Amino acid sequence: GAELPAPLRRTGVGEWLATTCQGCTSWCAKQIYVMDGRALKVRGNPNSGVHGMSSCPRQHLSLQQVYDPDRLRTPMMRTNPKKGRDQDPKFVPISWDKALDMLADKIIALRVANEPHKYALLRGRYSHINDLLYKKMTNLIGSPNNISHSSVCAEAHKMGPYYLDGNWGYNQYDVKNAKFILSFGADPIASNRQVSFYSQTWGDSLDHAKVVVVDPRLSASAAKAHKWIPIEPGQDSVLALAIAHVALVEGVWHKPFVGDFIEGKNLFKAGKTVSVESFKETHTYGLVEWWNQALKDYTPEWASKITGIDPKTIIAIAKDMGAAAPAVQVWTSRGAVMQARGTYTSISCHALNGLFGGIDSKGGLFPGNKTPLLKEYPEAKAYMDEIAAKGVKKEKIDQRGRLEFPALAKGKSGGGVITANAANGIRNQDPYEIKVMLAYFNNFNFSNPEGQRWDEALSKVDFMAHITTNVSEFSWFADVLLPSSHHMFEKWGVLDSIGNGVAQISIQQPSIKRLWDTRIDESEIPYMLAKKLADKGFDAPWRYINEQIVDPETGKPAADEAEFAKLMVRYLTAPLWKEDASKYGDKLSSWDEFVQKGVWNSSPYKLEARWGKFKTETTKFEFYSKTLEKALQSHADKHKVSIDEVMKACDYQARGHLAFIPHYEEPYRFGDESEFPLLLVDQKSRLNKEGRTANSPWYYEFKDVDPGDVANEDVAKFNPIDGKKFGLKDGDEIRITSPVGMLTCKAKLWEGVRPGTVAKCFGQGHWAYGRYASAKFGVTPRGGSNNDLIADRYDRLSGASAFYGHIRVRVEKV
Amino acid sequence: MRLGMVIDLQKCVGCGGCSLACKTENNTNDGIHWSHHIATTEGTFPDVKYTYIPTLCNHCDDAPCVKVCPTGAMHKDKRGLTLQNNDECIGCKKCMNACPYGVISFNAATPHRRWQDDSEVVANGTVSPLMLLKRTGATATPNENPERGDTYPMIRPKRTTEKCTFCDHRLDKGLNPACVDACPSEARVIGDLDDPQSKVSQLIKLHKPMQLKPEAGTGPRVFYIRSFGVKTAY
Numbered sequence A: 001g002a003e004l005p006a007p008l009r010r011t012g013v014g015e016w017l018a019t020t021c022q023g024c025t026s027w028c029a030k031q032i033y034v035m036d037g038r039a040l041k042v043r044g045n046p047n048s049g050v051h052g053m054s055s056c057p058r059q060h061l062s063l064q065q066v067y068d069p070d071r072l073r074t075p076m077m078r079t080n081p082k083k084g085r086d087q088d089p090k091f092v093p094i095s096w097d098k099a100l101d102m103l104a105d106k107i108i109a110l111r112v113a114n115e116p117h118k119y120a121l122l123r124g125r126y127s128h129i130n131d132l133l134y135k136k137m138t139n140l141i142g143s144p145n146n147i148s149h150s151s152v153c154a155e156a157h158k159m160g161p162y163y164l165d166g167n168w169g170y171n172q173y174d175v176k177n178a179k180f181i182l183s184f185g186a187d188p189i190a191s192n193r194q195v196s197f198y199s200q201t202w203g204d205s206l207d208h209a210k211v212v213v214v215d216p217r218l219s220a221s222a223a224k225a226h227k228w229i230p231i232e233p234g235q236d237s238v239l240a241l242a243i244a245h246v247a248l249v250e251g252v253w254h255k256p257f258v259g260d261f262i263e264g265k266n267l268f269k270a271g272k273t274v275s276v277e278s279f280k281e282t283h284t285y286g287l288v289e290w291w292n293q294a295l296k297d298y299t300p301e302w303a304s305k306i307t308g309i310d311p312k313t314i315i316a317i318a319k320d321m322g323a324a325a326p327a328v329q330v331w332t333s334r335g336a337v338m339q340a341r342g343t344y345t346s347i348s349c350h351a352l353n354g355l356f357g358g359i360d361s362k363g364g365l366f367p368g369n370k371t372p373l374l375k376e377y378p379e380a381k382a383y384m385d386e387i388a389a390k391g392v393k394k395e396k397i398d399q400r401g402r403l404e405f406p407a408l409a410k411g412k413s414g415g416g417v418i419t420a421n422a423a424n425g426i427r428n429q430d431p432y433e434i435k436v437m438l439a440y441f442n443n444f445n446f447s448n449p450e451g452q453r454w455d456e457a458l459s460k461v462d463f464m465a466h467i468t469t470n471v472s473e474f475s476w477f478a479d480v481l482l483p484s485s486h487h488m489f490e491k492w493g494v495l496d497s498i499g500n501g502v503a504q505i506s507i508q509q510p511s512i513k514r515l516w517d518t519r520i521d522e523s524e525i526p527y528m529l530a531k532k533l534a535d536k537g538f539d540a541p542w543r544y545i546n547e548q549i550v551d552p553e554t555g556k557p558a559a560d561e562a563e564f565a566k567l568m569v570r571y572l573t574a575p576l577w578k579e580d581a582s583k584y585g586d587k588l589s590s591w592d593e594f595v596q597k598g599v600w601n602s603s604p605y606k607l608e609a610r611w612g613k614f615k616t617e618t619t620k621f622e623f624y625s626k627t628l629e630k631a632l633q634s635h636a637d638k639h640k641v642s643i644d645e646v647m648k649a650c651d652y653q654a655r656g657h658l659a660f661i662p663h664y665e666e667p668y669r670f671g672d673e674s675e676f677p678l679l680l681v682d683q684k685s686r687l688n689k690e691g692r693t694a695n696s697p698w699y700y701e702f703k704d705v706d707p708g709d710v711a712n713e714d715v716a717k718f719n720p721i722d723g724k725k726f727g728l729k730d731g732d733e734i735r736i737t738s739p740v741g742m743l744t745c746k747a748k749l750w751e752g753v754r755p756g757t758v759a760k761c762f763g764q765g766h767w768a769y770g771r772y773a774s775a776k777f778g779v780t781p782r783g784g785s786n787n788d789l790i791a792d793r794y795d796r797l798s799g800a801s802a803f804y805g806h807i808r809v810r811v812e813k814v
Numbered sequence B: 001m002r003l004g005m006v007i008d009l010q011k012c013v014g015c016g017g018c019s020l021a022c023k024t025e026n027n028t029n030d031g032i033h034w035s036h037h038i039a040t041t042e043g044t045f046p047d048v049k050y051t052y053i054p055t056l057c058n059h060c061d062d063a064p065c066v067k068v069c070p071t072g073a074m075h076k077d078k079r080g081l082t083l084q085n086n087d088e089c090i091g092c093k094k095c096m097n098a099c100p101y102g103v104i105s106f107n108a109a110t111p112h113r114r115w116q117d118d119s120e121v122v123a124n125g126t127v128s129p130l131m132l133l134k135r136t137g138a139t140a141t142p143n144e145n146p147e148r149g150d151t152y153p154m155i156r157p158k159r160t161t162e163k164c165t166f167c168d169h170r171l172d173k174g175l176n177p178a179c180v181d182a183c184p185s186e187a188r189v190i191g192d193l194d195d196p197q198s199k200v201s202q203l204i205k206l207h208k209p210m211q212l213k214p215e216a217g218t219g220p221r222v223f224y225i226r227s228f229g230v231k232t233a234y
């Protein structure tokens, strides 16, 4: 135990290798420290322009994922032909060649029978090399059913940005220059999409920004904010609309962006209409129409009656935002908008970003910077045979585009995925049966609301293969398991991130020798499957790969699996390192320099870039969304109904012009409030790497970094008022029941919970995944599975699943 | 020389990244965390305050753990750190009762015993803790950091105590403590409190410093500045 002499000391002499973390869609650039062939540490990549060395705490849990003792080391096949929660699959090990043979035989049988559309590809997480496995392979087989997870993620959060300013996507928030931050449910030092960077900056920003957090629970961000507004779930838009109302009455919209009355005098008087011709809008459209049709009556008193918020607080917030403009940013979280009528909460909250001029402004918010990363491999039309051309025209299994499922992504009827509804199409064989399914990086039985519907659906699929590191809940229903090399340590990939005024592109690369007999989901596996299909007489995918996915420097196809894995990344990133990317950001001299740095950074965002040229119908920032009217009109015309009939069929309250402006939709609620007196407030753990750290012991050891939670436990948090009402004490074993299901967990009394609600982290309740994540693997869960409580409901205008606002529950001691 | 740390509570977001970094750096057994925290919730709804205070060894000026140690295993070094010759620890636990802060842990459990399990959740399909140990070449856990062994056992023996060493092995190489490097907001700063020009010396002049349990008379050298929360507006 003597200290080692200097020549034999080991501190600091190991190797740092660049990769990318995917614990959340922050997608931080990382370096991995390697010594004795083992990954020992993770840090933020110092070359990153978004976040630098800053990181959230979950980077360290990555090390218990790659070295998870319940990872699969071999392909497997089930030997119990029955599937179900009660059916042990009795998996036995097989070779890759045998596993892909079974899958290939089933795919080819579909084509021979002229039913290629009965194939489905399911995608959970992914990297930007996904186009081959997700889209090209699927369409070449002849199926339209490439089903992402986007609608169980955040599609409703894109409705406001798209239908108001043309951005079907996320924003970055300029916190370093903000003077007012208003968060509707966002908790950016714990979740959302740059936890590393917003954690870096949040505390410092409190010295120049006033911060208000609107959330039914006291989140970490609210605990470090100037005001916590404990909103009743589903009432966010009431506050957003009343703030806008006060802004107009007080005359404190941002005139350089919005415009002004022609004669100077502010004519917005509460309750009274204004002449449209009296106002000259600059970069916006529809302000007076919005006022005349609804906003003139969304007074602070109206809002206080619904929410209990002091009207003086509403007025003070509106005035503070007016004085801070344009250095004003409004965040929306999933909690505010992933509700059955949530499209109009996204619109109502995001409208404030236009009203106070924050959109594309200093201290405001704006989209990701332009980069030259390619996102698709070459077109495959020339490789489509007649079977495939017919199949890809079939209705999608998720029923997108039907009257009651407009899913208006990017303005198109049926434009968006409806992930959770694919289970309903499958189990009802409507539009048709799914007979062959390939799925990767996903666990929809656990992550989708009312996931037992996925139990039911998958039990009815003739053949399914799951590409996964662990035997998760979804894997339980697979015929074949195809073990994936771990995305962060054993894979070639590429991702991007936005924040700090920049967009970055980062590499994923293997940092260790491959541990087990696994293959990379998005490159090696489709390559091997294409070879197997070609051996069996269907060579279109193989020809597509070998003729179109060739090296950007040599023009040669990959010689083998390992080369192909790297080639997939080289191909899409060639504009960064083979060509001169100086016009967009960094100049990289070679592929090797890109790999060594591990990240490419854009130049800083040009403020006001989009002013006067939004990708909306008017090219303006639309308070009256002609963009959404055009999309709804298209959907209505498709189904030979009026727009009002669309609204009625999709269970929105809006009629007439209200369908196109920010307005109040009463939140949808399910269940009798007398039997189910509490509203569920679902939240993420700040130690969740999505649904993937429940088999990491360090997760449990530090679980109380979630404010109010308890180490090594799964707790539901009740206000002490409700604890007294229901006879609950800390540590009591409890059952929580909704109209659709139940879970068991433990009780915690916490004053940071709005009375009448119960705040509980999603992430526990696994009955599979591994030995730490479950009580008895395959049988008994650890903790309680939130989504068993959440009825299968949709924001039908976006396709999004609802996880918030509508869930009523009751509680009792077990 | 009196090395110490200043922690800025306004910058701190209460994420535990420092404590997880310590786990990866120092190979502490499951349940043993040299870096930890004290969190408090105060007030009745809706006027609720939550605060998180990161904690570690305070490397005290007048360390009672050193004074009571019967073997001399616990000792001060020339940097002012409280370090331990683990080889001379007899597991008497006197240090733990003397320390006012509860930052010392006792290895009653065999460290990393959960990695000796060779059961598989799916037989001949998934792996096992023991198999992962064999595959990676590690001795006790695939997550063990060999650097730790420069100055302290990489894996401590049962029936010894252990605590934060201020990442002495990293300081010896001119590097930063793992928890300092791990902090996203740079809330943690270390330096020589005897140097008036050090960043730590200047921080506690620019801001009013606070210490945990100064009344215990140990002269702790972790100082807290500013506030985790802010006063409510409106």
Ligand SMILES: Nc1nc2c(c(=O)[nH]1)N[C@H]1C(S)=C(S)[C@@H](COP(=O)(O)OP(=O)(O)OC[C@H]3O[C@@H](n4cnc5c(=O)[nH]c(N)nc54)[C@H](O)[C@@H]3O)O[C@H]1N2
Pocket: A023, A024, A025, A026, A153, A154, A184, A185, A186, A187, A190, A191, A192, A193, A195, A214, A215, A216, A217, A219, A231, A232, A233, A234, A235, A236, A332, A333, A334, A335, A336, A681, A682, A683, A684, A685, A686, A687, A688, A689, A690, A691, A804, A805
């Ligand atoms: N730690 C962690 N961070 C992550 C992820 C993760 O898994 N773990 N996933 C990433 C991904 S994929 C996503 S899509 C983003 C999502 O990031 P966000 O969209 O910002 O939201 P969530 O993290 O899902 O948190 C939902 C929050 O809404 C609150 N809330 C619940 N109901 C209501 C309501 O009715 N009104 C209001 N105002 N609030 C309500 C909950 O308390 C919770 O704080 O996070 C990314 N960041």
Ligand SMILES: Nc1nc2c(c(=O)[nH]1)N[C@H]1C(S)=C(S)[C@@H](COP(=O)(O)OP(=O)(O)OC[C@H]3O[C@@H](n4cnc5c(=O)[nH]c(N)nc54)[C@H](O)[C@@H]3O)O[C@H]1N2
Pocket: A123, A124, A125, A149, A152, A153, A154, A440, A441, A442, A443, A444, A446, A447, A448, A467, A468, A469, A470, A471, A472, A473, A484, A485, A486, A487, A488, A521, A682, A683, A684, A689, A690, A691, A692, A762, A786, A787, A790, A803
């Ligand atoms: N109640 C509630 N439900 C939610 C959320 C919430 O906040 N509350 N968050 C929702 C959100 S925002 C999202 S985006 C969705 C995400 O939901 P999903 O896309 O279903 O993602 P996960 O649940 O993380 O499942 C990923 C699965 O991939 C496997 N896998 C794990 N690691 C790897 C790897 O490295 N490679 C490969 N090929 N496979 C791997 C495992 O089977 C793992 O279970 O969950 C959502 N569901």
Ligand code: SF4
Pocket: A021, A022, A023, A024, A025, A026, A027, A028, A055, A056, A057, A058, A059, A194, A195, A196, A689
């Ligand atoms: S978990 Fe998310 S925020 Fe944290 S380091 Fe990984 S990608 Fe970044």
Ligand code: SF4
Pocket: B011, B012, B013, B014, B015, B016, B017, B018, B019, B054, B182, B183, B184, B185, B186, B187, B188
């Ligand atoms: S890493 Fe930094 S911000 Fe996170 S808890 Fe530790 S000191 Fe605070």
Ligand code: SF4
Pocket: B056, B057, B058, B059, B060, B063, B064, B065, B066, B082, B098, B099, B100, B101, B102, B103, B104, B163, B218
């Ligand atoms: S904090 Fe405790 S263990 Fe550390 S030096 Fe002070 S008395 Fe000793």
Ligand code: SF4
Pocket: B068, B069, B070, B071, B072, B073, B074, B084, B088, B089, B090, B091, B092, B093, B094, B095, B096, B160, B161
């Ligand atoms: S347990 Fe070890 S370090 Fe502590 S007082 Fe006893 S001999 Fe000294």
Ligand code: SF4
Pocket: B018, B021, B022, B025, B026, B034, B035, B056, B057, B163, B164, B165, B166, B167, B177, B178, B179, B180
């Ligand atoms: S200084 Fe080193 S040993 Fe001490 S808490 Fe920080 S990481 Fe752990």
Ligand SMILES: [Mo]
Pocket: A152, A153, A154
């Ligand atoms: Mo998501």
